[PDB]
Swiss-Prot record, chain A:
Protein known as: T-complex protein 1 subunit alpha
Keyword tRNA-binding: no
Encoding gene, per UniProt annotation: TCP1
GO cellular component: chaperonin-containing T-complex; plasma membrane
Chief location bin: cytoplasm
UniProtKB/Swiss-Prot annotation, chain B:
Family recorded in the similarity comment: Belongs to the TCP-1 chaperonin family.
Protein name, entry field: T-complex protein 1 subunit gamma
Annotated disulfide bonds: 359-365
Stored PROSITE patterns: TCP1_1, TCP1_2, TCP1_3
Gene coding for it: CCT3
Subunit record text: Heterooligomeric complex of about 850 to 900 kDa that forms two stacked rings, 12 to 16 nm in diameter.
Alphabetically ordered keywords of this record: Acetylation, ATP-binding, Chaperone, Cytoplasm, Disulfide bond, Nucleotide-binding, Phosphoprotein
């Protein structure tokens, strides 16, 4: 079975060449693929990795499974190192690359046995790749289904399917998607990107989950501690002060107690202490601040001056939120006031600019809402739910559901998953093969067949009959190519993939199974390049 | 090298079944003994389920996962060590023919097990009965369940007192729409912390509301009780103040040495003046206190406690409310500790302590154990922990489940009723849990010495037609009512037992390959 007893090539070692090393290479690459194969897809099963000491871990991460696999043949190490490189360019797909690469090598070995030279297999595979990539560009789509319809809600519903909030996903998934669509922005130099850390989250147990609110702006958890001011200020526009340093009456010192026998002296002290802090208030008023957001609070005498000036002083603001409000309004978060000997805001230097500020009551919560800043690209969601337990879990599900949708939206160039690209390529490359008429079509046809290992593996991991699902999958894609040259159809049949939960063929674009373009182009090339490196080995010397 | 496909499934279940067998004799008050044969010339007869699993090496990683199940159970609740291991093993055994004979994909197996868990959890609640956890006498009867058949049975009145008062104090009994709902969260390990002080006897132990500090004081004779307590927490020591920059002092005349000494005294005083300015009554500093500082503060009408770590100052801050301040000069007048009943500095067992007992319950307490020797102190502590674990399990939920295998049999019968209504391939692995649950009433009969089939069949029939309080008499082996023969256990244990047993089985069932590598 093993390749030994060379009895040729008088060197200090053995010689393995020809069909011997070629079959050995096939066995090695299959041995590696047989380990990672079952991790493909969200429905797949994990595997156990046990070390030489006595410890183990269980994971479905293809990168970890491959890296921690004991591989005694360099033919398999090439594919493990390939996956390690994949992580450094894409960050995912390691499982699908090894699976494809193994199938291509196995198929190639059959071509060799049928008297197709390895050089013509390598050539044909590369020719197929060039057309395969060009095909991906045709099924390529951008961010769609946001105007007049939403499919992004199926992305959020999927991410919430394991969360307590999932029961109300028919109502909340709109908030996840709408919160993100409303804040589509540009970070720098026209990148065009959805915000990473946008959409603040609050909670209150005042009503049922369907009463959760989406606010187009910052909901700052704070109050004004007085009814003197109206709940709506700055009809035309607002200057906003985002301050940390308090506006409390001056003290002689925190460790000193004022002991006065003559009331006249105490009144003089209290008035001077007010006079000191009023320097901060007066400069805030003179700088035109209509809303004063102070973290450590505003004194009663200081608020009085603001109220009389028709300025809304806000007490007990959250500094962490002011960091984002300040930037959104163009303001500077003031950790301390000073100029040289006195203190000031330098004539609206620390202040920002925004449209409207309102004081909203949320039924057991209370915020000052900052809406319409110079540039915010953010929002706030206030979560409601069955009980406090659900509120904390709902926040976690919101953070996750936002991340999943943003990752899909992060790429402006996406392709359907679920085997759509692989099965669609299967049809296209099978047709391409017929236009050669010489030798390459043999490798091209086998290349197309190899691509089907992915929709096959996904079905197996779903506990479904992979033969019917793949046959039906290909049938839809074949139809989408039949009408392609004419554009005459009742249905495009295009982008239909494997539903790995219900076991049927679905429209993946609406279902929400999307992968970025770069994943499919890189995966096809990565698998091929490793295959070529192994197919080029017709001799091994073992010293 | 590796075990793939059905090799992993058979190997994982095979090992887990072997682990379950080890401890099948450990169930019930009539548990039988096992002989543990060491690599050395010794042998251990200890029948504790934890020790048996700990002291017996296992080979297969699946068996090691089973060991982790028991370790997790021990951390979550005070019991169930053998229940989760026996049950999880039987669940795997019941799923075995479905993976092999029926060729049911592991994905199908796992889905049904999750559904069976949900239903099992409901039934455990339905068959349970409430107890008024606010009736101390009723609680004492429950706590004694874990104290009897032990040498310390004659302590059980005091053990119940210590356990019940401490857990009630720390129980986060709160609900509101703003600060959230702790849902009666109890963590006795962090909040009920117990301290052992030499001297006295078990009857002299007390639960304190506050912090018990083991550090000594600057003088043994200081005020013990304060009318208006004010507490200072400082890091920085009270010693000669030095600058941060370069200083060069050149003395020629000896007379100027006294001037330096006077300055050194002043700098220490100035630190104490800032402390005294805010009219404190107890000052705690992490670092030391100079001899001058000791007199400077005491003469001001306050007590001084030294060498108290930040970790203790955090506890002091919770029960006093005092803010920890690093630099002495920055101490604020807002640092208070009022409504504190005592600052007692009593020396107990020839060791100095400091007590901050107050009238507050800031989600924490300390148990102070007394005893005439370290052995007595350890014996009280080690046995008290059992009482406290039960007090936690009961006070965390007023529902008690029937024992003697009754609860597990009720789950078996009720799951069977639902199984007939479950459509699809999942019907098969769903039954697996329904049958597996009966490993408990079955094992109890075997360890009692009865007929595992004839008595189990009668037990099932009683639940099928009658009530769910029918169980096995541990001593007689007869089928008896669990209200007449009270063997009731907190629901908390039963819910976690079935939960972690099924989840553990799922972790092994879903692994179809074990491969080697580093």
């Amino acid at each position: 079975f093993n390749n030994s007893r060379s009895d040729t090539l008088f060197l200090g070692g053995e010689k393995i060449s020809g069909d011997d090393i070629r079959n050995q290479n096939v066995l090695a690459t299959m041995a590696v693929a047989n380990v990672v194969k079952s991790s493909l897809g969200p429905v797949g099963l994990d595997k156990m990795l046990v070390d030489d000491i006595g410890d183990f871990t269980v994971t479905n991460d293809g990168a970890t499974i491959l890296s921690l696999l004991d591989v005694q043949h360099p033919a398999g190490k090439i594919l493990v190192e390939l996956a390690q490189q994949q992580d450094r360019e894409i960050g995912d797909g390691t499982t699908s690359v090894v699976i494809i690469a193994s199938e291509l090598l196995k198929r190639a070995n059959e071509l060799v046995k049928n008297k197709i030279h390895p050089t013509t297999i390598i050539t044909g595979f590369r020719v197929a790749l060039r057309e395969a990539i060009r095909f991906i560009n045709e099924v390529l789509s951008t961010s769609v289904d946001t105007l007049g319809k939403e499919t992004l809600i199926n992305i959020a519903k999927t991410s919430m399917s394991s969360k307590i909030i999932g029961a109300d996903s028919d109502f909340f998934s709109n908030m996840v998607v709408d919160a993100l669509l409303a804040v589509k922005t540009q970070n720098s130099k026209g990148e065009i990107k959805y915000p990473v850390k946008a959409v603040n989250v609050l909670k209150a147990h005042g009503k049922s989950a369907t009463e959760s609110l989406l606010v187009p702006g910052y909901a700052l958890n704070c109050t004004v501690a007085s009814q003197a001011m109206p709940k709506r200020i700055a009809g035309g526009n607002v200057k906003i002060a985002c301050l940390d340093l308090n506006l409390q009456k001056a003290r002689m010192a925190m460790g000193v107690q004022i002991n006065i026998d003559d009331p006249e002296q105490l009144e003089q002290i209290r008035k001077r202490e007010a006079g000191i802090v009023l320097e901060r208030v007066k400069k805030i008023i003179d700088a035109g601040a209509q809303v004063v957001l102070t973290t450590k609070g505003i004194d009663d005498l200081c608020l009085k001056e603001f109220v009389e000036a028709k300025i809304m002083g806000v007490r007990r603001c959250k500094k962490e939120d002011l960091r984002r409000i300040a930037r959104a309004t163009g303001a500077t978060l003031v950790s301390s006031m000073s100029n040289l000997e006195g203190e000031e805001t330098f004539e609206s230097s620390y202040l920002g600019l925004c449209d409207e500020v309102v004081q909203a009551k949320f039924s057991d919560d209370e915020c000052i809402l900052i809406k319409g800043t110079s540039k915010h690209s953010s929002s706030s969601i206030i979560l409601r739910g069955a009980n406090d337990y659900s509120l904390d879990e709902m926040e976690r599900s919101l953070h996750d559901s936002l991340s999943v949708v943003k990752r899909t939206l992060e790429s402006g160039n996406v392709v359907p998953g679920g085997g759509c690209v692989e099965a669609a390529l299967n049809i296209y490359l099978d047709n391409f093969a017929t236009t050669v008429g010489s030798r390459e079509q043999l490798a091209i046809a086998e290349f197309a067949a190899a691509l089907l290992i992915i929709p096959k593996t996904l079905a197996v991991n779903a506990a479904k009959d992979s033969s019917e699902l793949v046959a039906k999958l290909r049938s839809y894609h074949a139809a989408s190519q039949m009408a392609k040259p004419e554009d005459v159809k009742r249905r495009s049949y295009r982008n239909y993939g494997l539903d790995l939960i219900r076991g049927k063929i679905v429209d993946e674009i609406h279902a929400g199974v999307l992968e970025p373009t770069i994943s499919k182009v890189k995966s096809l090339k990565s698998a091929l390049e490793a295959c070529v490196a192994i197919l080029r080995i017709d001799t091994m010397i073992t010293v | 090298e590796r075990t793939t496909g059905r090799q992993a499934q058979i190997s994982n279940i095979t090992a887990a079944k072997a682990v379950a067998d080890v401890i099948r004799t450990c169930l019930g008050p009539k548990a039988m003994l096992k002989m543990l044969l060491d690599p050395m010339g010794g042998l251990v007869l200890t029948n504790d389920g934890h020790a048996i699993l700990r002291e017996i090496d296992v080979a297969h990683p699946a068996a090691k996962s089973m060991l982790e199940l028991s370790r997790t159970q021990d951390e979550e609740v005070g019991d169930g060590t053998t229940t989760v291991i026996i049950l999880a093993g039987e669940i795997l055994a019941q799923c075995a023919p479905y993976l092999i004979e029926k060729n049911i994909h592991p994905v199908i197996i796992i889905q049904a097990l999750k559904k069976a868990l949900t239903d099992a959890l409901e039934v455990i609640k339905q068959v349970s009965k409430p107890v008024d956890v606010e009736n101390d006498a009723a609680m004492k009867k429950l706590i004694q369940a874990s104290i009897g058949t032990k040498y310390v049975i004659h302590w059980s009145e005091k053990m119940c007192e210590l356990a019940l008062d401490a857990v009630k104090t720390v129980r986060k009994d709160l609900g509101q729409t703003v600060e959230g709902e702790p849902n009666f969260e109890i963590d006795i390990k962090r909040y009920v912390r117990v301290e052992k002080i030499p001297g006295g006897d078990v009857l002299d132990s007390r639960v304190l509301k506050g912090v018990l500090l083991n550090k000594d004081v600057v003088h043994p004779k200081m005020s013990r009780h304060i009318e208006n307590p004010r507490v200072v927490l400082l890091d920085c020591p009270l010693e000669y103040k030095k600058g941060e920059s370069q200083t060069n002092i050149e003395i020629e005349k000896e007379e100027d040495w006294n001037r330096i000494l006077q300055i050194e005294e002043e700098q220490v005083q100035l630190m104490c003046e800032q402390i005294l300015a805010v009219r404190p009554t107890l000052v705690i500093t992490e670092k030391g206190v100079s001899d001058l500082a000791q007199h400077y503060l005491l003469k001001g009408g306050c007590s001084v406690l030294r060498r108290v770590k930040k970790s203790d100052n955090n506890r002091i801050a919770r029960v006093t409310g005092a803010t920890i301040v690093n630099r002495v000069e920055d101490l604020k007048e807002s640092d208070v500790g009022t409504n504190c009943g005592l600052f007692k500095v009593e020396m107990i067992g020839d060791e100095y302590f400091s007590f901050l007992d107050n009238c507050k319950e800031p989600k924490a307490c300390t148990i102070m154990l007394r005893g005439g020797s370290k052995d007595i102190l350890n014996e009280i502590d080690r046995n008290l922990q059992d009482a406290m674990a039960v007090a936690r399990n009961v006070m965390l939920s007023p529902s008690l489940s029937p024992g003697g295998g009754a609860t597990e049999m009720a789950v078996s019968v009720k799951l069977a009723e639902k199984a007939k209504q479950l459509e699809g391939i999942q019907q098969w692995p769903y039954q697996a849990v329904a049958d597996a649950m009966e490993c408990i009433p079955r094992t109890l009969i075997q360890n009692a010495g009865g007929d595992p089939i004839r008595l189990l069949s009668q037990l099932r029939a009683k639940h099928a037609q009658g009530n769910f309080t029918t169980g096995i008499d541990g001593d007689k082996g007869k089928i008896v009512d669990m209200v007449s023969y009270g063997i009731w256990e907190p629901e908390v244990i039963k819910q976690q037992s079935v939960k972690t047993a099924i989840e553990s089985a799922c972790l092994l069932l879903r692994v179809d390959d074990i491969v080697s590598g580093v």
